[PDB]
From Swiss-Prot, chain A:
Organism, as annotated: Caenorhabditis elegans
Name listed for the protein in its UniProt record: Small ribosomal subunit protein uS2
Known function: Required for the assembly and/or stability of the 40S ribosomal subunit. Required for the processing of the 20S rRNA-precursor to mature 18S rRNA in a late step of the maturation of 40S ribosomal subunits. Involved in cold-warm shock-induced translocation of the RNA exosome components from the nucleolus to nucleoplasm.
UniProt keyword terms in alphabetical order: Acetylation, Cytoplasm, Ribonucleoprotein, Ribosomal protein
Family stated for the protein in its record: Belongs to the universal ribosomal protein uS2 family.
Gene Ontology CC: cytosolic small ribosomal subunit
Lineage per the UniProt record: Eukaryota, Metazoa, Ecdysozoa, Nematoda, Chromadorea
Protein's cellular compartments: Cytoplasm
Curated annotation (Swiss-Prot), chain B:
Any single GO CC term annotated in Swiss-Prot or TrEMBL for this entry: cytosolic small ribosomal subunit
Species name: Caenorhabditis elegans
Cofactor(s) demanded: Zn(2+)
Name of this protein: Small ribosomal subunit protein eS27
Highest taxon, organism lineage: Eukaryota
SUPFAM superfamilies assigned: Zn-binding ribosomal proteins
One GO-annotated biological process of the protein: ribosomal small subunit assembly
Primary gene name: rps-27
InterPro entries named in the record: Ribosomal_eS27 (IPR000592), Ribosomal_eS27_Zn-bd_dom_sf (IPR023407), Ribosomal_zn-bd (IPR011332)
Protein family per UniProt: Belongs to the eukaryotic ribosomal protein eS27 family.
UniProtKB/Swiss-Prot annotation, chain C:
Subcellular location: Cytoplasm, Cytosol; Cytoplasm; Rough endoplasmic reticulum
The organism's taxonomic lineage, starting at the top: Eukaryota, Metazoa, Ecdysozoa, Nematoda, Chromadorea
Residues found modified as Hydroxyproline: P61
Family of the protein in this entry: Belongs to the universal ribosomal protein uS12 family.
Organism, scientific name: Caenorhabditis elegans
Known partners and oligomeric status: Component of the 40S small ribosomal subunit.
Highest rank taxon of the organism: Eukaryota
Name of this chain's protein: Small ribosomal subunit protein uS12
Curated annotation (Swiss-Prot), chain E:
InterPro entries documented for this protein: Ribosomal_eS21, Ribosomal_eS21_CS, Ribosomal_eS21_sf
Subcellular location(s) per record: Cytoplasm, Cytosol; Cytoplasm; Rough endoplasmic reticulum
Name of protein: Small ribosomal subunit protein eS21
Any GO CC annotation of this UniProt entry: rough endoplasmic reticulum
Source taxon at top rank: Eukaryota
GO MF term (any one): structural constituent of ribosome
Subunit details: Component of the 40S small ribosomal subunit.
Gene3D superfamilies according to UniProt: 3.30.1230.20
Lineage of producing organism: Eukaryota, Metazoa, Ecdysozoa, Nematoda, Chromadorea
Annotated family: Belongs to the eukaryotic ribosomal protein eS21 family.
GO BP terms: endonucleolytic cleavage in ITS1 to separate SSU-rRNA from 5.8S rRNA and LSU-rRNA from tricistronic rRNA transcript (SSU-rRNA, 5.8S rRNA, LSU-rRNA); endonucleolytic cleavage to generate mature 3'-end of SSU-rRNA from (SSU-rRNA, 5.8S rRNA, LSU-rRNA); translation
Main location (coarse class): cytoplasm
Keywords assigned by UniProt, alphabetized: Cytoplasm, Endoplasmic reticulum, Ribonucleoprotein, Ribosomal protein
Length: 207, 82, 71, 99, 81, 215, 129, 22, 121
RNA sequence: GCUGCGGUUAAAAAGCUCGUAGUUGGAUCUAGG
RNA sequence: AUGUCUUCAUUAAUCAAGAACGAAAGUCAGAGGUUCGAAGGCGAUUAGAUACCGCCCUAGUUCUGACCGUAAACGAUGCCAUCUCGCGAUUCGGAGGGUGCCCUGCCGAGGAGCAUCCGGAAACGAAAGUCUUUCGGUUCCGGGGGUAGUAUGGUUGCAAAG
RNA sequence: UUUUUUUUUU
């Protein structure tokens, strides 16, 4: 996306998706995500996944203070990715149970004031989505074919239900945000302080 | 979705839409010239024919009426007339 | 629903009149036997002759003997 | 106050449904309303299967089974505890309980 | 609103949804204002201080149409092909 | 006063100076000191104090519900309800609730658009349970033709001339006041031709004075 | 049985506007419907619309601009005299600053402001605001 | 079975009234 | 009965979190430690706290305990997190014979892609 | 209660259908330049 | 219902008066009379027990030909037309494929259910929504609770009663 | 198995 050839879907990037099965959606289709479906499992269109990801990345970058971006997930497969994403992007991460009253109860010591909320799944983190609507906080989420888009601002179609694809999708979002920040660049790659940040730094590892 | 082109519907949807509820009604039936092995006389026939259309000369049954489209006798093919 | 046509004036008027009789106030004011049923015959006051003095037990939860008179 | 959306029956697209006589009380209850229970049991209680087998006159005999379809009216079902009252929310659950 | 002999005597002019053109009331807390940063096609780095503002009303967000609403606004503005 | 929210911090630091920017950005208000700072002409009134009783094993537990209406007579009104075990605390909490619920009220003209607005921009109806209140624009000098309860709210909102039509169990003070409040606040949500012009979205206070927030 | 194509069309428009859709399809189109929509467009309450021909009553597709509060028909078409026009507008329209009462007069279908300019009465068709 | 019995009572009363009127 | 109240449980948790080094698996050692590390107004209370601390130590040895944060265990967890293999499992080098279904009809063609490794099953 | 009421549970949809009076009835004929 | 490039061309919707059908019980006549069973009679229970429980049963329950025209005759929601949401199941017919079954996010017509805008006093309702932003057409009905569906008059019926 | 009642006002 971006109306540019320097930000287009690259060959190895698209390669990674079929490696991680990040294009195999569920067998149920939500009528609001009939756009990102190319024709058993409903395989999603890769190009749409790319364009939405860049769109989400630009939105996250608009929050000048990275702390105000809060990433929330309760999926066990996302606990690894969520920690890394916050570490590299300087965001704030919520793991497991999302304490209700996080964004509405000003007395709570857990009280937070996000400017942008990123969700691993609308259904799993329904409480965060609901809490956001009480404070006018836009929400970005990774959405599968059957997921509900209610109160979802930007939905990045992908395979969040997958074990490996979920981690990869978080990895690109951190990359795209960093690429569009000056920390890294497309040619240099996902490197900070001389360390290769590798996709399986995010993948879920069984204890 | 809120923004849907009601003026130019997708052709596949127009095909998989009821004949009356399309933007402009169009029947799903057609006229077909039927060729039967043997007399080799082309005969025009309505797809949803409810009468037993009979060969003019050879007096062989060409279609059998049914609940929907007429069933062609075995050995007889058809081609859609424009 | 009620009729709404441009030429339903008769139905509307007749229905209104028919249903006005199901109104207690209208029926009480137009029944026709008002004068023969009301003891005062439609007046505000009336003169009478006392026949006896009676006591009426007050309704609950009150208790007293109200001093009434038969006229 | 209307307690149930189906009004306690399973009658849709229908005017009249024939009744059945309850198993215990004998009361007439519409077939869609009656609590039905299909029971398949061993012809002999579990504690005597070994005795019957050891007394069997045949080397290998398959013990038959009793099949009974039971119909209960609401009263005789509640009393027998075949079915129980539920909370307002749990009333709408339609899945059979674990067995 | 213009009134009087040409003056504006309104307390404030409310925002309107970028997609449905519906007024966003003072107590509409389900409405959002997303900002997308501007980029240079070649370098790929954000232009400091430049962004695109989209406002979506609570009703549209609640119907779940905010996804395609934002996508269509972005396509119109060229952020997406 | 030590603000606990970003909005409160900005208001205390005088980076947000009018209630109109908060209303424009639809930012929720969670501290009454924000309203105290940004509107210095508010006056409050206790419309009613009604006791409510909850049955228990040892008789009835009685608490008092207080309804309070606050407003500046210049297009800002708010309604608050608080139930507590004592009348004093109920009144204090209701004042706080009304302050937090302060809302803007659009005023318009009935006929000639000369002078300052005096009445409601258009026929606006609000509803609560069964009480529905409809406010109809009126010409100048007419005053407020309404019941004593909606009259107080209209006076506080600053409406000068207005006809009313109230239907339902108006003897329910709380619902009557809430219906009036809803009708008053519908004014800045009714889309009239004079708001058709497409404006440009600006920075939110969080977007603009964020250097202080981060610092 | 259908008896007011204008009522059906205006109801469809209202429902689509509430749902926030961008286009609306109107079935049995008619001259009265076209004139009503033309008045609404001239006053800026709708966008452009197309009259789809199908060798029958036809259809219309209207572009909604998200600016119409309500478009309603008045049935039966009561006769409105120029003297009671004021009462009717005060009763039906939300304010004197906006909203229009559509009448059909001998001159043609127009709004109440034009009818009062030309000193015409007629039968009321509907109103929008 | 509280108003139905009042209906029965009134039906018996009406039967008696018919018989007496005859 | 033998259920420990929240007073004892909270005190034990704070003590374990603040003096993990001094807490062994011996009741007498834990008691002696508590005597000097905390001001407890009752000998029975101190003994209850020491006993629950020992019982918590026994579980800490087996594995991580919720509510308790132990330095060495969090070092171990962060090491397992930081584990990054020598080369990607998604590196084009390993991506050789991806068995893809007919989905490549145009999903991988109209996007402008001619991936060599994809093999249509 | 025409403007302007209500009829699942508060009073109130006839058991259901046919049917005369009454009431109400699809689109369509000179638009443009 | 579906299919239909068949035919007619406004012939339609709702309907005072008027008319057909209308559970069960009930009435008349003739047959049948197993089972069950109002009334009735006994045995229990009880302070009593004209009841619940048990036993024996009459009308009835069944068939044919006539009457009655009422039910919580209920979805306690009149009929016709139209608009507004998602999902996956189900009955019938059709279209397109694979091997009666499977698939087509297939097309209509039903009967529902759970994601439900708006509505509602609420319970709750995809209608009970699109209504103070009221107004598609039309029929019937209500106007605080009783007296009372009573009295009287009229009419229908053998009666009961409507 | 049996298990009926509880003056008026406050």
């Amino acid at each position: 996306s971006g109306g540019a050839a320097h930000s287009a879907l690259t060959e190895e990037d698209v390669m990674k998706l079929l490696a991680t099965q990040a294009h195999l959606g569920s067998t149920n289709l939500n009528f609001q995500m009939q756009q990102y479906v190319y024709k058993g499992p409903n395989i999603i269109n890769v190009k749409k996944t790319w364009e939405k990801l860049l769109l989400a990345a630009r939105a996250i970058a608009a929050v000048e203070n990275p702390a105000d971006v809060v990433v929330v997930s309760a999926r066990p497969y996302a606990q690894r990715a969520l920690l890394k994403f916050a570490a590299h992007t300087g965001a704030t991460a919520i793991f497991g149970r999302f304490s209700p009253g996080c964004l509405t109860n000003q007395i709570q010591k857990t009280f937070k004031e996000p400017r942008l909320l990123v969700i691993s799944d609308p259904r799993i983190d329904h409480q965060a989505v609901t809490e956001a609507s009480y404070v006018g906080v836009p929400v970005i989420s990774f959405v599968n074919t059957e997921s509900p888009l209610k109160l979802i601002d930007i939905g990045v179609p992908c395979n969040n239900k997958g074990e490996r694809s979920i981690g990869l999708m978080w990895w690109m979002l951190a990359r795209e945000i960093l690429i569009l920040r000056g920390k890294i660049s497309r040619q240099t790659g996902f490197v900070l302080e001389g360390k290769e940040i590798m996709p399986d730094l995010y993948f879920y590892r069984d204890p | 979705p809120l923004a849907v082109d009601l003026l130019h519907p997708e052709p596949q949807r127009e095909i998989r839409c009821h004949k009356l509820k399309r933007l402009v009604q169009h029947p799903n039936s057609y006229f077909m010239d039927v060729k039967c092995s043997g007399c080799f006389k082309i005969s025009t026939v309505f797809s949803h024919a409810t009468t037993v259309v009979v060969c003019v000369g050879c007096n062989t049954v060409l279609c059998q009426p049914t609940r929907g489209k007429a069933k062609l006798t075995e050995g007889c093919s058809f081609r859609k007339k424009q | 629903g009620k009729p709404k046509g441009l030429c339903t004036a008769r139905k509307l008027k007749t229905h209104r009149q028919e249903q006005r009789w199901n109104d207690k106030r209208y029926k009480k004011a137009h029944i026709g036997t008002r004068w023969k049923s009301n003891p005062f015959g439609g007046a505000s006051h009336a003169k009478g002759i006392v026949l006896e003095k009676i006591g009426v037990e007050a309704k609950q939860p009150n208790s007293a003997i109200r001093k009434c008179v038969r006229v | 106050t209307f307690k149930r959306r189906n009004h306690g029956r399973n009658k849709k697209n229908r005017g009249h449904v024939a009744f059945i006589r309850c198993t215990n009380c004998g009361r007439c209850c519409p077939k869609d309303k009656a609590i039905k229970k299909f029971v398949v049991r061993n012809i002999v209680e579990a504690a005597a299967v070994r005795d019957i087998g050891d007394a069997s006159a045949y080397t290998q005999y398959a013990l038959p089974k009793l099949y009974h379809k039971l119909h209960y009216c609401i009263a005789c079902a509640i009393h027998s505890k075949v079915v129980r009252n539920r909370s307002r929310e749990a009333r709408r659950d339609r899945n059979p309980p674990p067995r | 609103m213009q009134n009087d002999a040409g003056q504006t005597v309104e307390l404030y002019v409310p925002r309107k949804c970028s997609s449905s053109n519906r007024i966003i009331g003072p107590k509409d807390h389900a409405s959002v204002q997303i900002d997308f940063v501007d980029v240079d096609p070649e370098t790929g780095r954000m232009i400091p201080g430049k962004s695109t503002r989209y406002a979506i009303c609570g009703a549209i967000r609640r119907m779940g149409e905010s996804d395609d609403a934002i996508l269509r606004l972005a396509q119109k503005d060229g952020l997406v092909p | 006063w030590t603000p606990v929210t970003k909005l409160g911090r900005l208001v205390k630091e005088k980076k947000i100076t009018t209630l109109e920017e908060i209303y424009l950005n639809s930012l929720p208000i969670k501290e009454f000191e924000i309203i105290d700072a940004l509107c210095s002409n508010l006056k409050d009134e206790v419309l009613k104090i009604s006791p409510v009783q909850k049955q228990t094993t040892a008789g009835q537990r009685t608490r008092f519900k207080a309804f309070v209406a606050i407003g500046d007579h210049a297009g800002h009104v708010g309604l608050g309800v608080k139930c507590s075990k004592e009348v004093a605390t109920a009144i204090r909490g209701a004042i706080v609730a009304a302050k937090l619920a302060v809302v803007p009220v659009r005023r318009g003209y009935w006929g000639n658009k000369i002078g300052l607005p005096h009445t409601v921009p258009c026929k606006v109806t609000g509803k609560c349970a069964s009480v529905m209140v409809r406010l109809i624009p009126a010409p100048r000098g007419t005053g407020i033709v309404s019941a004593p309860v909606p009259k107080k709210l209209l006076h506080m909102a600053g409406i000068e001339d207005c006809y009313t039509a109230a239907k339902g169990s108006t003897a329910t003070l709380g619902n009557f006041a809430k219906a009036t409040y809803a009708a008053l606040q519908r004014t800045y949500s009714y889309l009239t031709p004079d708001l058709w012009k497409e404006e440009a979205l600006e920075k939110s206070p969080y977007q603009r004075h964020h250097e202080y927030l981060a610092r | 049985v259908r008896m007011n194509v204008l009522a059906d069309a205006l109801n469809a428009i209202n429902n689509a506007e509430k749902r926030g859709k961008r286009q609306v399809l109107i079935r049995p189109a008619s001259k009265v419907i076209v004139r009503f929509l033309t008045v609404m467009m001239k006053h800026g309450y709708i966008g452009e619309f197309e009259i789809v021909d199908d060798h029958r009553a036809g259809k219309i597709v209207v572009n909604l601009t998200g600016r119409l509060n309500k478009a309603s028909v008045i049935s039966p078409r009561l006769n409105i005299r120029l003297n009671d026009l004021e009462k009717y507008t005060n009763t039906l329209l939300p304010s004197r600053q906006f909203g229009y009462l559509i009448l059909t007069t001998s001159a043609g279908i127009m709004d109440h402001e034009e009818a009062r300019r030309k000193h015409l009465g007629g039968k009321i068709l509907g109103f929008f605001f | 079975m509280r108003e139905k019995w009042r209906k029965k009572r009134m039906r018996r009363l009406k039967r008696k009234r018919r018989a007496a009127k005859k | 009965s033998r259920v420990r109240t929240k007073t004892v449980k909270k005190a034990s948790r704070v003590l374990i979190e603040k003096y993990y080094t001094r807490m062994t698996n011996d009741f007498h050692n834990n008691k002696r430690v508590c005597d000097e590390v905390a001001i407890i107004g009752s000998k029975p209370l101190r003994n209850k706290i020491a006993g629950y601390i020992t019982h918590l130590m026994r579980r800490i040895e087996r594995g991580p305990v919720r509510g308790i944060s132990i330095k060495l265990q969090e070092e171990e967890r962060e090491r397992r997190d930081n584990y990054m293999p020598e080369i990607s499992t998604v590196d084009p080098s390993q991506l050789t014979s991806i068995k893809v279904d007919t989905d490549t009809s145009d999903m991988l063609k109209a996007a402008g892609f001619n991936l060599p490794n994809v093999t249509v099953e």
